[PDB]
Amino acid sequence: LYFQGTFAERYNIVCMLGKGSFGEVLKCKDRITQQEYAVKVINKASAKNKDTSTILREVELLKKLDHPNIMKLFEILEDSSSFYIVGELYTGGELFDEIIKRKRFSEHDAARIIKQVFSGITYMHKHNIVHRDLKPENILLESKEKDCDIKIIDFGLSTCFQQNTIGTAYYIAPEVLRGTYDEKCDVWSAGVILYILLSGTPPFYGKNEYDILKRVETGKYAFDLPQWRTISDDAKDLIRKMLTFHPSLRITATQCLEHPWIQKYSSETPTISDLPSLESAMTNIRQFQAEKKLAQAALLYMASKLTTLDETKQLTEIFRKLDTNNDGMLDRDELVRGYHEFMRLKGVDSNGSTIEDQIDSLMPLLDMDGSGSIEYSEFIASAIDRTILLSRERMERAFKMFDKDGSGKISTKELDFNEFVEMLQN
Numbered sequence: 144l145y146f147q148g149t150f151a152e153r154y155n156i157v158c159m160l161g162k163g164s165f166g167e168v169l170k171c172k173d174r175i176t177q178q179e180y181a182v183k184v185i186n187k188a189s190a191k192n193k194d195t196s197t198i199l200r201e202v203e204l205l206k207k208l209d210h211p212n213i214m215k216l217f218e219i220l221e222d223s224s225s226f227y228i229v230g231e232l233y234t235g236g237e238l239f240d241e242i243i244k245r246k247r248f249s250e251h252d253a254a255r256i257i258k259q260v261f262s263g264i265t266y267m268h269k270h271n272i273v274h275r276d277l278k279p280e281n282i283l284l285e286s287k288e289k290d291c292d293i294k295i296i297d298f299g300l301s302t303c304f305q306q307n308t309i310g311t312a313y314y315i316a317p318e319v320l321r322g323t324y325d326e327k328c329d330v331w332s333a334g335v336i337l338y339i340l341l342s343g344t345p346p347f348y349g350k351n352e353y354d355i356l357k358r359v360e361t362g363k364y365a366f367d368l369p370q371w372r373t374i375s376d377d378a379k380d381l382i383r384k385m386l387t388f389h390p391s392l393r394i395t396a397t398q399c400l401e402h403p404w405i406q407k408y409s410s411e412t413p414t415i416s417d418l419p420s421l422e423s424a425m426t427n428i429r430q431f432q433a434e435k436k437l438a439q440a441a442l443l444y445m446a447s448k449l450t451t452l453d454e455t456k457q458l459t460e461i462f463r464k465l466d467t468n469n470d471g472m473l474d475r476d477e478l479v480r481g482y483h484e485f486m487r488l489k490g491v492d493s494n495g496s497t498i499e500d501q502i503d504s505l506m507p508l509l510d511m512d513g514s515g516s517i518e519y520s521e522f523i524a525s526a527i528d529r530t531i532l533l534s535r536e537r538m539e540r541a542f543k544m545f546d547k548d549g550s551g552k553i554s555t556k557e558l559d560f561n562e563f564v565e566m567l568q569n
């Protein structure tokens with residue numbers, strides 16, 4: 144395997160997309176699957192701030208982050224000059240451009256959007272990761288479709304790498320001017336984002352960066368602009384709690400998510416339309432509940448690494464409607480209510496075994512990291528057709544994602560292609 148790069152052997156570079164933090168971001172495509180991905184290329188010599196052992200450790204945790212509103216990293220690969228961080232490709236651009244186009248949003252539309260930031264940030268903070276620089280330019284739109292998920296990018300690598308080289312000043316908490324970060328800085332930044340969403344203007348506005356940072360110094364903002372009068376007191380109460388000056392008195396990410404104003408506007412719930420879609424989710428999980436253990440884990444690794452938007456976009460809607468508390472993961476109770484609601488909408492009396500014992504029995508097989516929750520990939524794994532999950536191209540990639548040494552055959556420590564194909568086609 145001498146004349147083969149790890150990145151080069153697997154992905155072709157299509158084109159540059161942008162200059163990201165710590166290095167360039169490019170569009171690349173898998174040479175077998177043809178599926179396209181974004182890749183950030185980071186120069187080792189120049190950007191390295193830690194040893195590679197620390198960098199690969201840090202990035203591994205970032206890869207294991209599983210949340211609909213957080214960018215999904217697939218892998219970190221290296222050659223003699225660079226690191227290559229490969230992730231989901233988004234096509235909808237920055238939330239920032241949405242602000243410019245719409246100028247500002249209804250309480251409904253601002254609620255649906257910021258709810259997703261709260262969801263992602265809450266998950267980030269549960270895993271002890273602060274963004275440090277939350278802003279509209281670091282929130283990407285998944286696609287061009289209407290109510291598409293937003294995706295928080297660009298965090299986690301801050302001690303690993305070193306940058307070299309406008310408008311960030313609007314979003315920085317005051318404590319950050321004191322050289323301090325903590326989880327409450329992200330809340331502040333998200334409060335500013337929200338104020339801009341509902342009003343179209345930042346709370347600490349000014350002509351240049353000196354004067355912007357001067358108002359941010361004082362902590363003084365108001366709901367003075369004429370447009371604030373036809374905006375509820377509930378949005379005002381949330382902003383006030385987020386733009387509280389002292390971090391210790393400022394609300395958490397979770398309380399942002401749980402705020403009454405959030406609850407009121409983002410209550411999309413399951414309907415008759417979802418029944419056939421929901422019926423498809425059932426069949427595929429129903430065997431996943433009694434499908435082999437080596438099958439269950441092997442399926443989780445495939446659907447998690449090699450899916451695409453247009454494939455799982457249906458499961459994505461269903462997931463959302465079951466996610467009644469809006470944190471981006473499915474707990475035990477939400478599944479049970481969803482199973483009750485499913486039956487009710489179909490006309491079948493719930494009150495074999497009960498819905499409650501069936502879910503109780505499903506959770507251990509379904510929650511495979513033992514998280515207590517059913518994260519997005521665990522759902523997709525379970526509730527997708529293997530009729531479309533299993534194409535030759537994907538098996539070919541899978542086959543090579545486990546053969547570490549590059550033999551043409553798999554060893555026991557790691558865990559023929561035709562013997563591979565039959566195993567997965569059971």
Ligand SMILES: CC(C)n1nc(Cc2cccc3ccccc23)c2c(N)ncnc21
Nearest residue numbers: 161168181182183228230231232233296297
């Ligand atoms: C704004 C345009 C330069 N861009 N930027 C990204 C973010 C991104 C892509 C690939 C790897 C990453 C690793 C760490 C942090 C962010 C990464 C990105 C994306 N996902 N999809 C489309 N465009 C993107």
Ligand SMILES: [Ca+2]
Nearest residue numbers: 466472473474
């Ligand atoms: Ca949930």
Ligand SMILES: [Ca+2]
Nearest residue numbers: 510514516518
């Ligand atoms: Ca889990």
Ligand SMILES: [Ca+2]
Nearest residue numbers: 550552553554
């Ligand atoms: Ca091998």
